[PDB]
From a paper:
The protein sample from which crystal forms C and D were grown was analysed by mass spectrometry.
The [name]-catalysed forward reaction occurs at an important transition point in glycolysis between the enzymatic steps that consume and generate ATP. HsGAPDH was purified from the supernatant of [name] cells treated with the mannosidase inhibitors kifunensine and kept for 4 days at 37°C after transfection with a DNA plasmid for recombinant expression of an endoplasmic reticulum glycoprotein. A fraction of the molecules shows Cys-S-sulfonic acid instead of Cys in the active site. [name] allostery is mediated by intra-dimer contacts (the active site of one dimer subunit is in close proximity to residues in the neighbouring subunit).
Author numbering:
A (entry chain D), B (entry chain G), C (entry chain F), D (entry chain B): 2 to 335
The structure:
């Protein structure tokens, strides 16, 4: 149901979760905290988007509040999350989207300000992790601090679930060809901890490490220790693709894989896992809200036990909608 | 002393084979045929290159000849390859680089004009196929029409050879993240036979088919039927990467894989297979003449029998230098 | 009672005129001719668009007809325009969008098949030229073959009209920073007539010639011989900008220029000439149907008689909508 | 011997000035200060460059010193510029390249550590500004703190000097189509002071303000108040172009403009101002050390008194070489 939500951070994830909330109408955004972006600039950042276009609606600054579609939103400018007066603003759930308070200890600071539950929109080292359609039924009311995993884990886990349930994944190695992100540089610049990530994003294919495939073993415990992978950052603004190479236990002809994935996309994973037989390219998934879309034509099987499965994901819009979906699911269990 | 070479086609491959021949000095280009590009335009196309820079030397049109570094080259403008007077121009070997005469029957037309041997700089449905460092010792003087396989086969085969020789490849699936090519479109355009390839190259990650992994099974017969793969075209002008996910027969710790690849790069495959432990990105391989460069840091192993190996290749420069190397080898056997 | 339209050519202009016709609902597309693109491929090309997104509606092939939003469209595959049965399909006006039948003689072939009028969606060497909001009132029922000028002319002419009407343009020089087009190459390739245009579109800023400023003197005869310009093609998939540097007769303070442009955008040029004071960038105009949008903030004046005026244009959508608007106007005059 | 130089900051300008110093051999780099980049990372950042390629020479860390081509360089890590012991390291001139100490008061801090002169590699609000080939002869030994102006001012001023000296510039408006810079963002992000500059660099043409044309009026006093302009940032990694639209006092034919520019490029402005009649595109100027290269073919004249002149500049390499040249000139006057 329509729970009141607070968003910590108005960066790429925070703005798109706010966007998804107003577009879907599943939740009500009532407060936003950002100590670095003032109200007039938030109006501009929310109104215009290079990737997803101008917001379909109205965005104004009125009496110190951000008014989206006539709905006023309280704006906070606190650096310390324990100082945010979430309860005063009426925010029941808080989306922790800054990327710097991902442990339960750090994310728990929001409970001090009056928030009832915290949803970390990033992987967490210790919080319970969820992927809608995969393990969201393991959520219960005793859980006050949870994580929605990453955009990549949300793409891989629904597909891994269907393949493992039907044929059994003996082992798998994944590659994600990922669009550019805010942490990258326009030209060769400093990135002290991750040297390759400092190289010009526009000119390069950049290998990167990702714990997304390993994280699938947390949301699907039977796949713990059976998956790992890496990423390549390429010069596209949005939409990424997962390439899963795996060994199956039971033999599976490629048409049998297509059949079970199509069945899952039409039934229990409708809206989360998509299925296509069309000649799609990455831009066909811009602003697509699925977590994962299986590309039947792009995948290839060496034999009945060794296949490469391809799945597209709008790394911005799929994930943002899953955060709203997770919160709406949580509200139904209150 | 060096073999005199004729080049059919002054497209991307033809110009870069000509550049490799003058840069390496291993062979002498004496004739070029192109029915659509006149002498003045050939000077311009060879002199300036967006990817590899201005040619390191002199290029001018003098008395109807293309003069590169003081060497005059006879220019032909024939549409029918059987009409090119290669013998008159002194061209002993002909590089068939147009991409439209890839069968032994079609490529054989150059023998009518006086050429002694033909090297198809592309895969052929029936010509004997070679990869330098892998099976070039299987070449013999009776072979008048041969193929140098594709750029991607030249990246995968040297790495597959080392891995198979030391550990044994039970099976493998490859993905190549490939730079854009001349067959792609700037904006969504017609590509009747391959619909995805007509979509805008600048805006998209495009899945594509490739027979390069399967072709490794022809150059390394022990791997016949054991490898397959696909490609993703991404918006970079040059430099591609191979991602080989394979299952090994003998156990191999990742440090053992690094050791054998490094050994091969320093010895028998020197200049063909490279090895790096540096934090490299694609642009670090621009104008690199190796067929394949193993990126030790980028690869990942799930266990001692299931690994993902990463190898970079300048899809233009590496291959064009191998065409010149193959010719130099053929000349030594005359 | 909307006019029934036939579209010759399903290239980027033809598809976008069809998309504009269904989106605006001003005209009814009843027939499309393209000898190289079959019905199944037309569904794909219309449905998916890298730049403007998936078509918002339904598009399917049903009993040899292209059905868009339940409206069946007859499909022809004729190479000779005089052989197209436009009359049998019910097409009253024909949009000549192939770019190869731009003279009165060539475009007139469509009248043989039963079309009543022909609108060339490109500049013509001899047909009367129109720009909506500038000289569309000079159209009369005796004109069976007309031209809608080019996208750059449709951007410059509405702005030049307002400036000349209020202050008088003594002389002007225009630069257009233009997005990439279908005539460009992905990598350095052959472009025999225009050498710079063959260079890789993704890697370069390419200077190019344009007769668009000179052609403003044909639609606004008072400006004949007073304007010229050039273009720079840059690696963006869509949206271009005009930069008009002109010498004014009457003194014009920058706030007076803003006032008259804003007035025109709200009144007679509503929908054609836009006006903004927002901090916009090119993506803010993606799928914007205006011919020209004056950017108040980007412009600069040296003195009251020498200014640089900036106007954005979606080179694809704005022009397409003007083709539809021109045909709707012609229909009102029947 | 050659003057010994210290470089404050190892960002894009600092590294490329160091690269220019070793490549040209005009000055000796003996010390570098950067409080955020450690020695091992400096080796990596200097050795590999996506834009200009791997450094032509040797670079290694040895005994806490950066050794380039056998020359050891002392490395400092000071946040306060008054604390850098330039005198101890033997640094006579200091290049202030951080972009944050551009006033004479702030840049003067380097004199406290023992530096004799400071060259600000950026525009300064109060320091004397110089452009090589334009006003470098106005430098004298009493000037301890000077500025080398900006990369755009160094492109425009040599061309403006030739045009004004021969024909007289009554007034001029400039546009620079500029490659992407380190201050831009990969995806829509925060840029509080300049909102348009925070928009995604890969997806957009971004209008920007520049004082570069106005600054030409300081280096060439008889052009004060006669020039202004603006910029468009476009998605290319390097090389930019100046488009000068100017009114001339003495009416000149375009061939007369070509003649005087060619003459200047062959004589007094040799190596500073280039001249070409070739069909060049931006990539043809990658790693070109000229400040400005007049493109004869790209420019357009409306009449004998109103012209648009085009000049290319490698915004990275041209400017860095002028910093070195300015210091070599200062050394000759000691």
């Amino acid at each position: 149901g329509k729970v009141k939500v607070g968003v910590n951070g108005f960066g790429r994830i925070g703005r798109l979760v706010t966007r998804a909330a107003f577009n879907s109408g599943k939740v009500d955004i009532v407060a936003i905290n950002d100590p670095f972006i003032d109200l007039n600039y938030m109006v501009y950042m929310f109104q215009y988007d290079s990737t997803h276009g101008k917001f379909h609606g109205t965005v104004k600054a009125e009496n110190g509040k951000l008014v989206i579609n006539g709905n006023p939103i309280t704006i906070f400018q606190e650096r310390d999350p324990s100082k945010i007066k979430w309860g005063d603003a009426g925010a029941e759930y808080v989306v922790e989207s800054t990327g710097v308070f991902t442990t339960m200890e750090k994310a728990g600071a929001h409970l001090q300000g009056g928030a009832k539950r915290v949803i970390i929109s990033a992987p967490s080292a210790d919080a319970p992790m969820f992927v809608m359609g995969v393990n969201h039924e393991k959520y219960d009311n005793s859980l006050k601090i949870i994580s929605n995993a990453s955009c990549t884990t949300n793409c891989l886990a629904p597909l891994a679930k269907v393949i493992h349930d039907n044929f059994g994944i003996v082992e798998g190695l994944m590659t994600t060809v990922h669009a550019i992100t805010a942490t990258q540089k326009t030209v060769d610049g400093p990135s002290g901890k991750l040297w390759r990530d400092g190289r010009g994003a526009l000119q390069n294919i950049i290998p990167a490490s990702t714990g997304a495939a390993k994280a699938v073993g947390k949301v699907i415990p039977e796949l713990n220790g059976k998956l790992t992978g890496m990423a390549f950052r390429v010069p596209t603004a949005n939409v990424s693709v997962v390439d899963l190479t795996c060994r199956l236990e039971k033999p599976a002809k490629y048409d049998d894989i297509k059949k079970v994935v199509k069945q899952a996309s039409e039934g229990p994973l409708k809206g989360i896992l998509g299925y296509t037989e069309h000649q799609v390219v990455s831009s066909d998934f811009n602003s697509d809200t699925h977590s994962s879309t299986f590309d039947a034509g792009a995948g290839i099987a060496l034999n009945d036990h060794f296949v490469k499965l391809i799945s597209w994901y709008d790394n911005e819009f799929g994930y943002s909608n899953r955060v709203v979906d997770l919160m709406a699911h949580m509200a139904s269990k209150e």
